[PDB]
Nucleic acid binder design. Sequence first.
DNA 1: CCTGTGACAAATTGCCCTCAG
DNA 2: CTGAGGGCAATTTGTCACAGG
Length: 223
Amino acid sequence: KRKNSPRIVQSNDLTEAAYSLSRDQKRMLYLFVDQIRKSEHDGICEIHVAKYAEIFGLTSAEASKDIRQALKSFAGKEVVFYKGYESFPWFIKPAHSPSRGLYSVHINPYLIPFFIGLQNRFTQFRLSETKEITNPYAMRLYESLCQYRKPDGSGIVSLKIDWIIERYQLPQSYQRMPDFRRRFLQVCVNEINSRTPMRLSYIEKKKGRQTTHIVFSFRDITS
DNA sequence: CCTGTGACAAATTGCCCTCAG
DNA sequence: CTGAGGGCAATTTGTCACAGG
Ligand SMILES: [Mg+2]
Ligand SMILES: [Mg+2]
Ligand SMILES: [Mg+2]
């Protein structure tokens, strides 16, 4: 049963926001949204090194490294919602540790309604589905794909490439499409195919000499 | 203009070790 | 013993010159 892992349920506004974060910063982001979901919430969240190591198959010393550098790298990271245009900071206070092996973070109290969206306008996935991805961009794509998933784990969706560049905030050399192909599309599609239960194919949409959309579709291995 | 590949750079990976308390 | 530190080589991500349709 896929039901063994936490159920991540985020608003589609988050699924579609424009931001940069590392794999490690996102692994934590999942744990934070879970914890608001279980409370009039105020923004204080807690992380235990020992538990984070259970969850991601890591050693105690390595989990401490990953948390400690992620938490430092939130400084100056804005998140932008869209159309619409609203920019917020993730943390309003620096994180700190009062007990050995435990950190206390203060997430911005305005983001919470953006996490807990309006009814039937939301994305959802088990934590197991995404814990073995490595590339953060491959994590963004798996999120967006999940947004279109029917009850039976199948779906089809067309994303415009300029929109992928803006929301996933991809590096500049990928505006030149042979590089986008080689260092993002093939790498992220292979990863979903090897690390998740999803089975993914795609076709490109040219207009004139240009490529403008990727047309993704997928079934679940439970077929 | 469009494409793919080779090369170099800079970054991320899981892993090894000391050491404090 | 846990976990806060330092460090590593190997691999993957990011940049871009060159050659062909
Ligand atoms: Mg990153
Ligand atoms: Mg609390
Ligand atoms: Mg690491």
